[PDB]
Amino acid sequence: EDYAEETATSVKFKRSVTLPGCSSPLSLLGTGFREKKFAIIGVKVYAAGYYVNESILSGLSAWTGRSADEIQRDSSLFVSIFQAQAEKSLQIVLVRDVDGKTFWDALDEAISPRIKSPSSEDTTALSTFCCIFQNRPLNKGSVILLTWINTSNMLVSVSSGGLPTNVDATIESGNVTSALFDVFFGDSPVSPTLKSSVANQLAMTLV
Numbered sequence: 149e150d151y152a153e154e155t156a157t158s159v160k161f162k163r164s165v166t167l168p169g170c171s172s173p174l175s176l177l178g179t180g181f182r183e184k185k186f187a188i189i190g191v192k193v194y195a196a197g198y199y200v201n202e203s204i205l206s207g208l209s210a211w212t213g214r215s216a217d218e219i220q221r222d223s224s225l226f227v228s229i230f231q232a233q234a235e236k237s238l239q240i241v242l243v244r245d246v247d248g249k250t251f252w253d254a255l256d257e258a259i260s261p262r263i264k265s266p267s268s269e270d271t272t273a274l275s276t277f278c279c280i281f282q283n284r285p286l287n288k289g290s291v292i293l294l295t296w297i298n299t300s301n302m303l304v305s306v307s308s309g310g311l312p313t314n315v316d317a318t319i320e321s322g323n324v325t326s327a328l329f330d331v332f333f334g335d336s337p338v339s340p341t342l343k344s345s346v347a348n349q350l351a352m353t354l355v
């Protein structure tokens with residue numbers, strides 16, 4: 149159809165989308181959910197959809213004909229996706245309210261271990277990134293867009309509902325851009341389902 153459904157949360161993701169600051173429409177490559185245990189039982193925090201400009205597919209021809217499992221366990225393939233000279237974006241849709249401390253804790257846990265010694269440029273990028281979320285309630289239904297323009301530039305947008313239409317911030321930092329990608333597609337993805345979904349789709353596409 150025109151929309152895909154994320155199994156666990158039932159959140160719908162349009163298969164082809166036009167995103168803020170992106171010239172060409174992007175195609176949905178995978179979906180998944182992120183769950184976390186704050187107390188006793190794990191709960192679903194958000195649904196996520198990863199999009200890519202179809203132009204990056206040609207750049208992954210070295211992996212043609214590989215299985216989903218081979219693709220999933222190949223770090224070089226995901227690094228190649230990150231390095232591709234095209235636009236990619238992650239659409240996060242909150243399925244529960246997220247308060248300030250919860251948000252900062254998660255951001256710190258994701259960034260800090262990956263950037264032990266931030267450069268002045270990284271600090272500036274992170275400050276700009278955080279400013280967008282400061283004094284901003286992240287209630288259920290909120291949509292966050294993390295768009296990769298290149299290996300060092302990202303466009304970030306947030307809405308309280310519906311796909312953002314504006315670019316809230318543009319940041320420059322290879323370390324921050326790389327760190328955020330690793331959060332979702334590295335060895336310990338926060339959303340194993342999202343990574344597996346992307347791997348499966350790539351296996352079908354790189355045939």
Ligand SMILES: CCCCCCCCCCCCCCCC(=O)O
Pocket residue numbers: 182184193194240246250251254255258292331338
């Ligand atoms: C566990 C609650 C976290 C709330 C997630 C809100 C989405 C913010 C997107 C910015 C990326 C920050 C990386 C951390 C991702 C994560 O821990 O789920």
